[PDB]
Structure 1
Amino acid sequence: EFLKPRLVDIEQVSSTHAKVTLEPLERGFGHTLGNALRRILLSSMPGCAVTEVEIDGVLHEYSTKEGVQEDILEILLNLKGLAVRVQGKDEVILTLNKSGIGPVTAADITHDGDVEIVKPQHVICHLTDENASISMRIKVQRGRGYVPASTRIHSEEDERPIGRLLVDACYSPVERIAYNVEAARVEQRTDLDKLVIEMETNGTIDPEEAIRRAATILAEQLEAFVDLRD
């Protein structure tokens, strides 16, 4: 004698913030599913993040461009945050080329079909000279979790180009996750509960797809776990 949870209304308060509710939860599984989902969501959500950057006139992270105010290292740190949605391919090379006085935000990147820049207002740099012009190529990969600069060296594969600027990859779009189990009194039933999962992300994964993917991964692990071949 059991019930099953069906995905019911999925409200989006902001572009980043979403509330996903699961209404027909039997007593006791509110917390179990809340916690399992929270864990998988925070740990395993596949996302995209900037992996490397090539700017022309800069040999190493510590030097400086003429006519800009942020250091190369700070520009890298700003690029780390760039939230980008690639649909089909895994590795995209975006090219940003802008000149003149003005704040160069992420919107100025040359817009390719498969790439969607979620927040065009994200600042990158501030120019200060009429003739100051910066060109660069940002290579963005797909990945899950967190891989630092120093680990990626294992797969070097002839990293010879000194122009290549490695950035630590934060491959994770989910920023925050909380769940609230509240009694979902349906007019003909005694003790049933609703799970309300409130999730805040950088605006890449849609809530439904996140929850579905988490449930998938948990289901696969439980498949492997249930069978016991002694």
Structure 2
Amino acid sequence: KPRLVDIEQVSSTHAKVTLEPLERGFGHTLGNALRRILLSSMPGCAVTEVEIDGVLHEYSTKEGVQEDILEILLNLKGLAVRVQGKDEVILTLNKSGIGPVTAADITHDGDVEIVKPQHVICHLTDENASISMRIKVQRGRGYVPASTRIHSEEDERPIGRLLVDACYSPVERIAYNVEAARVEQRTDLDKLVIEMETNGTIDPEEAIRRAATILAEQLEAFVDL
């Protein structure tokens, strides 16, 4: 079996994990299976519901903002968030004045972690102009669009609550590379090096461990039949 070690951490987002001792056919197999798991099945947190002040629907324009409500909703999807203890958390963006909204600006409460202080949400282009939107975050498995979310709602009077396409996937890109190695007493052994890029809401060591656990639960039923 392989021993997981040697974590070459490049940045907060990017990383390069390696698994040195692997059999002749164990380089491609696990790596390709993990690639299929990591991209498809990856638990995470992202924006779902948003309610903006002085805005009844999307496809309108707010006073004192150059970026439209439809354009803001798209920027909200790109914003990275990671929740430790809480399942769902509602943040509030209290800010005003001439200039760009850095990225944080929200009141820091509970277990909500923020990894983006530069990520642009919107630009304020007037003195008295003000914005105060309550943003909701939800936990899930995969990609859930806005079209699916209006079916089994049952009474959704909040018209201000403009819906967004949810994206519960931490990985941005994945790439494995198998290279030959000569360990302490060996003939022909592959070295699986898994290069992984993330949004920054979950660790690479934590993501790869959770991905392998999902495959074990699936393989558990296949033994006894």
Shorter-chain TM-score tier? over 0.9
Aligned to 1:145: 142
Report the number of matched residues: 225
Deviation at 1:13, TM superposition (A): 0.5
Aligned to 1:132: 129
Deviation at 1:90, TM superposition (A): 1.2
Deviation at 1:198, TM superposition (A): 0.2
Deviation at 1:157, TM superposition (A): 3.5
Deviation at 1:185, TM superposition (A): 0.8
Q: Root-mean-square deviation (CA), in Å? A: 1.0
Aligned to 2:41: 44
SS of residue matched to 1:151? coil
The answer as to 2:202 corresponding to 1:212 is no
Q: How does 1:8-23 map to 2 (within 5 A)?
A: 8-23=5-20
Deviation at 1:155, TM superposition (A): 3.1
Distance 1:112 1:35 in 2: 40
TM-score (norm 2): 0.97
Aligned sequence identity (%): 100
SS of residue matched to 2:58? coil
Aligned to 1:193: 190
Distance 2:16 2:190 in 1: 16
Deviations 1:130-151 (A, max 9, x none): 1001000000001111001111
SS of residue matched to 2:184? coil
Task: Identify unmatched segments of 5+ residues in structure 1.
Answer: none
SS of residue matched to 1:28? coil
Tell me which stretches of 4 or more aligned residues in structure 1 moved more than 6 Å. none
TM-score (norm 1): 0.95
Deviations 1:108-141 (A, max 9, x none): 1111231111111100111111100100000000
Distance 1:106 1:157 in 2: 34
Deviations 1:139-189 (A, max 9, x none): 000111100111112231421111111000011011111111111211421
Deviation at 1:107, TM superposition (A): 1.2
Deviations 1:190-228 (A, max 9, x none): 111210000011111211111111111111111111221
SS of residue matched to 1:93? strand
